[PDB]
Amino acid sequence: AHFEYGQTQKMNLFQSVTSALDNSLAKDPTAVIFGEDVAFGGVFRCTVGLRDKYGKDRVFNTPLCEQGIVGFGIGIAVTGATAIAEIQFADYIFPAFDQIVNEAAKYRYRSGDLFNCGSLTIRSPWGCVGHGALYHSQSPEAFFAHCPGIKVVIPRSPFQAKGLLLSCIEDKNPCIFFEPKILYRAAAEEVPIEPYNIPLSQAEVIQEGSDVTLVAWGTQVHVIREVASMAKEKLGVSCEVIDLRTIIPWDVDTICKSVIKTGRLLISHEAPLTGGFASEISSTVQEECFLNLEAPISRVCGYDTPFPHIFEPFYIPDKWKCYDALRKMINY
Amino acid sequence: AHFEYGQTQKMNLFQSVTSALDNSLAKDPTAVIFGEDVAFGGVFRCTVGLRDKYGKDRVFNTPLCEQGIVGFGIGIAVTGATAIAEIQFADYIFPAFDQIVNEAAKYRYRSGDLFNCGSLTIRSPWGCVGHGALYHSQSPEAFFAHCPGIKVVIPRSPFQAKGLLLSCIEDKNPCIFFEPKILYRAAAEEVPIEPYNIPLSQAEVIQEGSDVTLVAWGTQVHVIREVASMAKEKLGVSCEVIDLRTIIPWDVDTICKSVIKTGRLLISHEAPLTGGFASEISSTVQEECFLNLEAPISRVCGYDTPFPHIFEPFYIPDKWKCYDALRKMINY
Amino acid sequence: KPQFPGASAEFIDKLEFIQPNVISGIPIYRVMDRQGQIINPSEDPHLPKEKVLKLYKSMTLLNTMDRILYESQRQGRISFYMTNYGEEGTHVGSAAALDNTDLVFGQFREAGVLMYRDYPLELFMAQCYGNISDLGKGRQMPVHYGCKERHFVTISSPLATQIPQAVGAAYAAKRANANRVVICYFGEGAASEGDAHAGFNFAATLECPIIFFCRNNGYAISTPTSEQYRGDGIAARGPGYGIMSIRVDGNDVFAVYNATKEARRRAVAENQPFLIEAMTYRIDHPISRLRHYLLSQGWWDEEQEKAWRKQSRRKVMEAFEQAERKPKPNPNLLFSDVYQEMPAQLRKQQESLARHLQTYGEHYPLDHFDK
Amino acid sequence: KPQFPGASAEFIDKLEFIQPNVISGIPIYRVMDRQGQIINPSEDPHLPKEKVLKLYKSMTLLNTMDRILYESQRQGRISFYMTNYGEEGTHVGSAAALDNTDLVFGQFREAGVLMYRDYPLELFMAQCYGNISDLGKGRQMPVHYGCKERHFVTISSPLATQIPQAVGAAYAAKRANANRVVICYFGEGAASEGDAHAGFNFAATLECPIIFFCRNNGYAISTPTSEQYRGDGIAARGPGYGIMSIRVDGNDVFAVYNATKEARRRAVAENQPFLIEAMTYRIDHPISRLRHYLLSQGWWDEEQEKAWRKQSRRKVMEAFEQAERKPKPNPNLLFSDVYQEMPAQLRKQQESLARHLQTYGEHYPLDHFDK
Numbered sequence A, B: 001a002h003f004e005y006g007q008t009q010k011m012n013l014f015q016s017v018t019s020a021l022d023n024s025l026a027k028d029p030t031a032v033i034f035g036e037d038v039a040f041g042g043v044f045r046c047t048v049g050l051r052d053k054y055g056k057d058r059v060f061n062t063p064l065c066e067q068g069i070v071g072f073g074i075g076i077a078v079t080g081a082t083a084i085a086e087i088q089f090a091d092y093i094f095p096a097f098d099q100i101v102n103e104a105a106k107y108r109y110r111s112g113d114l115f116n117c118g119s120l121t122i123r124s125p126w127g128c129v130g131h132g133a134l135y136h137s138q139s140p141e142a143f144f145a146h147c148p149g150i151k152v153v154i155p156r157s158p159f160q161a162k163g164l165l166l167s168c169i170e171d172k173n174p175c176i177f178f179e180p181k182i183l184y185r186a187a188a189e190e191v192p193i194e195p196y197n198i199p200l201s202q203a204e205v206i207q208e209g210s211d212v213t214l215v216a217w218g219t220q221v222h223v224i225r226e227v228a229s230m231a232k233e234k235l236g237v238s239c240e241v242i243d244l245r246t247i248i249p250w251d252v253d254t255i256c257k258s259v260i261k262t263g264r265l266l267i268s269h270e271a272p273l274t275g276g277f278a279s280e281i282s283s284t285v286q287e288e289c290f291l292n293l294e295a296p297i298s299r300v301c302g303y304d305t306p307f308p309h310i311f312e313p314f315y316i317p318d319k320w321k322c323y324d325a326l327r328k329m330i331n332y
Numbered sequence C, D: 001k002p003q004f005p006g007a008s009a010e011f012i013d014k015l016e017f018i019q020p021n022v023i024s025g026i027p028i029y030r031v032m033d034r035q036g037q038i039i040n041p042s043e044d045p046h047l048p049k050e051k052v053l054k055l056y057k058s059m060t061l062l063n064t065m066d067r068i069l070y071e072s073q074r075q076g077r078i079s080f081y082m083t084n085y086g087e088e089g090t091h092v093g094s095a096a097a098l099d100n101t102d103l104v105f106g107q108f109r110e111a112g113v114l115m116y117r118d119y120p121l122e123l124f125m126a127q128c129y130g131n132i133s134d135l136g137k138g139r140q141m142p143v144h145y146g147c148k149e150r151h152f153v154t155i156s157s158p159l160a161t162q163i164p165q166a167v168g169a170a171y172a173a174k175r176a177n178a179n180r181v182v183i184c185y186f187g188e189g190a191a192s193e194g195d196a197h198a199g200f201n202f203a204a205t206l207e208c209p210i211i212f213f214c215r216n217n218g219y220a221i222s223t224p225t226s227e228q229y230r231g232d233g234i235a236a237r238g239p240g241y242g243i244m245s246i247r248v249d250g251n252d253v254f255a256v257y258n259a260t261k262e263a264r265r266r267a268v269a270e271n272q273p274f275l276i277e278a279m280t281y282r283i284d285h286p287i288s289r290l291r292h293y294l295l296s297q298g299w300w301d302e303e304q305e306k307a308w309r310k311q312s313r314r315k316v317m318e319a320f321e322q323a324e325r326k327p328k329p330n331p332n333l334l335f336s337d338v339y340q341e342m343p344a345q346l347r348k349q350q351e352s353l354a355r356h357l358q359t360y361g362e363h364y365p366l367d368h369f370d371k
């Protein structure tokens, strides 16, 4: 491997997603869940038990057609009902790109708020998994970040996944929620059994620090947490570790406040460097924090290739790649 | 309105595209052109006369189905034949996004170079047109910039369009060529009648200057040319004006060389700010040119909204928006 | 004897390919001939006089509006326009068979549904001019109409996208009970899009109360149907998805009404989709044919025709003149409704435009924009 | 009498919806029964003994390979695997009816086409292990096979994408003359994708020499066909696009061969597409049925069966062992072939990895990678 709310239970990240979906269908009689293979529980177990508990009209399989899954979900949402669509791997969200970018994101604007699909959420497994190669590993968030009118949210853990997914489901805008698949059955943590929300468009500073700011999302948050530890032990460097959580609209203020304090920024993500979301954060921080920058903002990202099978260990922006970049930046 | 090679003839930009396509089908017996409504000459006249000259098997209409147009063109190209597909507006390229991103871009890599679709070019009208609103105005290049394995090329004039389109057609990689539609029948210029090429992944410095670098592509190049003139007359500021031409792979070296000289950079594009390609240029120049930067790199872009009908005059990054940003940067 | 889950069929011991029947396709249902005469009395819907005069007046008012707005577009007074010629009967006839609250999705040939639903001429005009009265806030191209009150979902330019969406709205209607249908209109060119195959299959497998209404006029822009498909039009595709299907004469308002009435009745009772393909001409016209019927019954004459032609021109010209002299909406409206709530970074862009206009406003057409 | 460009049909004066016939669907063509007996002598292809033994040996060698690689996957020796159980006859039978140079597109159930085309066991293994012998350079998930020599286009994971691509390759073949077909395989689940509607319609309107070969085994992952479609399987969709169509018993190698032979002959002569839907089981098996036929003719017996089972296991195990002990390719190969030519900025990333490994290489599994 490269990496206050009432009663809780240990849950891994697949279980936390089920818990959020269960809490949703319990409290919102309009809500339905659909997509390929969700009825028997899904290919990553995220919908286990829900059709037996809520009914076949509420948790059901569609034909194998992703542009149809999203257009159908938009249609449900136009009527005001909560529509929770699944796309089986984020790599297969592209057939639905026109329905997401040209239709869902623009629905409310283009109608003058006469119609909307705010009650749509699209959830999909995301990110590398050790051996997924080109079409089981992708992290498409930067493709969606350039589309005003959708929100894109990615959690780092089971507690975070359930509170951010419930926020997506209840938010009155169409949301894509990317579930890091390599964490589905990784370590459990305590997760409240009843519903709770974590705000969208809010980053989280998970460790305070004074020398450098590190920003990541998804599984890569754990990588940068470990880089922080390596930096403290080997270099005596204090790192502020931030999980961005929402890709758009993103929390510009929390990131800029951190960088005004530290004077340094390193952004990391599994997605390719060119056009990746680190470019937006970098260019923005450079505009707002220019006079504070002690060194150039560093992006440690996947290379600009498709995501390889046998070469995955050499492709990912692992802790050594991030640490080496950090070391050079500290020495700039 | 907001804005050496043998014998030449005056051509506007639609005529230059026809000339390139004619030169292609004359010299390459494998080449075909297809898409919606191309047989009668196309909705912007770019294929007039070509079916009568080259034959119905070579210039022909497809059904109304963009994911089919691109998949069909990939298939032609797998056999080695030149396939020149049209997508009628760039706004309607999204149904083909999966075929472009998951298939065309990855074709060669994923097969070990056993198969490829290098002989595919997808051409499509692009950019604002005064009244196109949400679906006749889009500039999708940043969505494609995050996809390794395709090239994305945008000309600023008729001379540039013909030499860059012939380069796309002959390049051994799948290319998207975005034709700025508001220039189709704007001013003519002299264009060589016989074929010639302009290199891909090469920017052009069209006016030298010493105080600030301005970078744009498409029609926006003319806007920044006018900003340069305004800056010289009103501020005594010398601007270096650069047309990027190829969005990916982009000419990092020419842009960085300019900014090492000037110490200032302003990037402009019609596409929305967030996730737009100016973020990639900005973050890269900031990494390579950090010690030379006199002021923060400025991005003057469309707002983060869908592209409006009646508000277009207030939405576009026009010469006054670019000039005002430039003025603040010069005074930073 | 075969035991395959994927299909129910017998064995056959001889190789025989199945041939499409395209020369003798699905026949075209017609109620009245070109002279406005009822052909088969058992099929006459016997609609009452006031309803049939409403069908005729909605079609002709739509036609009057098209003439004026098409000229307005030729002059650059509005930027774009799509007419309804040849489609007045498919739209008024089908709209008349719906309940007022049945939800409609469509594209660019559906303004007659709004006109039957008494959409004000002021609001059609407001959208085309993008003026302050437009509830779409001037954001879309002309003829991208929508009305929440009249259950007509806002038009978008990308073709066929509304097809799977209509199916989702019909699934949600089924769950809500309350006995509503969704109708979804599209042309034969749009039916070639992937999203039509998505909508058609989902409606059948998920058992949705939806009418798919395809208008086939033989052309999509410059493309004749010989280059669009090779089967027997669109109706012949319905049965392959398990969808009950019919083809009708789109120049016959009563054939369209009857097929839509019966499709609505069965879709809502049975929770199954119906496909109607109405054949039309790209422009023996629906208005002329209904006028002949009216005459027969003694329900119209040349004097009434003259007075209505005059009155309709007056009503459209009044709306036209008012629409041209209204201001456009406040430029601040380009920033709202991107999300339900304006993100702070989007508010910052709005503030940036406001500062910009304070300094450079002389260079912007500020004078016909509100506040 | 109707004069509409979009369809050729008569009028009808009574409202009648067209009902899909799904209970009595398109019949299933069969040549031999479950006992391997020829049912209708006029349909017997009378393939010669050496060819029929090749069909049997290709299926069974494929089955032997599946058993071993499926176990390898259960142990984590390879990361992923898809078997061919139930699909050995659809693939070997159809491959046998093709010319060696006809181009094949497919998905995850087509390894039997490669096996009939004498693809070396070493190369199937090399791709699954991503070792130095893999011509795909170890870049894709296991079972994403491809072979330019044997005209088998590299597999990609996204379903149905290969369908419109196969149609483009067939259009290009038509233009090139030289009398080649393209075949395109996909499952019944993949046929629900928008790209299948695209491929099916383009092949008909552009008159392409292509065979669409749909395998229908009643399931796509967990989804039974009752949730996948409601028409009469996939074969019944062909005629709606103007495509000649047939349904065959996928457990009958001779029915599959006959239908593919005849589709190939007519597609290449007529430049028109053919659709074959072969019904199979998600796993009366194709191998058992052909073994009974062999016995009847006196072309096989229990001793030959024993010796071949032994020999095939030996050949697969030899290839397996060799594949596991080969190194993986040089990590530099993750950067080539993204474009034909490596862009300088991509070379910079390659140089960055090389510097990285010089300093931190102890942390990378460098020891089973080439150079």
Ligand SMILES: Cc1ncc(Cn2c(C)c(CCOP(=O)(O)OP(=O)(O)O)sc2=O)c(N)n1
Binding pocket: B036, B064, B066, B088, B092, C109, C157, C158, C159, C186, C187, C188, C189, C190, C191, C217, C219, C220, C221
């Ligand atoms: C996805 C997409 N592609 C292309 C277009 C361009 N387009 C096209 C190609 C039209 C022809 C539609 O033909 P139809 O048969 O669906 O309808 P009509 O005959 O009534 O125009 S209308 C139009 O705007 C579009 N709007 N959307």
Ligand SMILES: Cc1ncc(Cn2c(C)c(CCOP(=O)(O)OP(=O)(O)O)sc2=O)c(N)n1
Binding pocket: A036, A064, A066, A088, A092, D109, D157, D158, D159, D186, D187, D188, D189, D190, D191, D217, D219, D220, D221
């Ligand atoms: C675009 C897309 N969506 C979903 C998947 C996931 N998937 C799915 C949903 C499969 C079932 C395919 O069913 P089929 O009927 O086409 O074929 P088989 O029955 O032979 O598996 S195989 C598979 O990888 C995919 N590969 N591509």
Ligand SMILES: [K+]
Binding pocket: A118, A119, A120, A121, A168, A169, A170, A171, A172, A173, A174, A175
């Ligand atoms: K939502």
Ligand SMILES: [K+]
Binding pocket: B118, B119, B120, B121, B168, B169, B170, B171, B172, B173, B174, B175
């Ligand atoms: K090319």
Ligand SMILES: [K+]
Binding pocket: C106, C107, C155, C156, C157, C158, C159, C160, C161, C162
């Ligand atoms: K639409």
Ligand SMILES: [K+]
Binding pocket: D106, D107, D155, D156, D157, D158, D159, D160, D161, D162
């Ligand atoms: K595929």
Ligand SMILES: [Mn+2]
Binding pocket: C187, C188, C189, C215, C216, C217, C218, C219, C220, C221
């Ligand atoms: Mn049409």
Ligand SMILES: [Mn+2]
Binding pocket: D187, D188, D189, D215, D216, D217, D218, D219, D220, D221
């Ligand atoms: Mn299947």
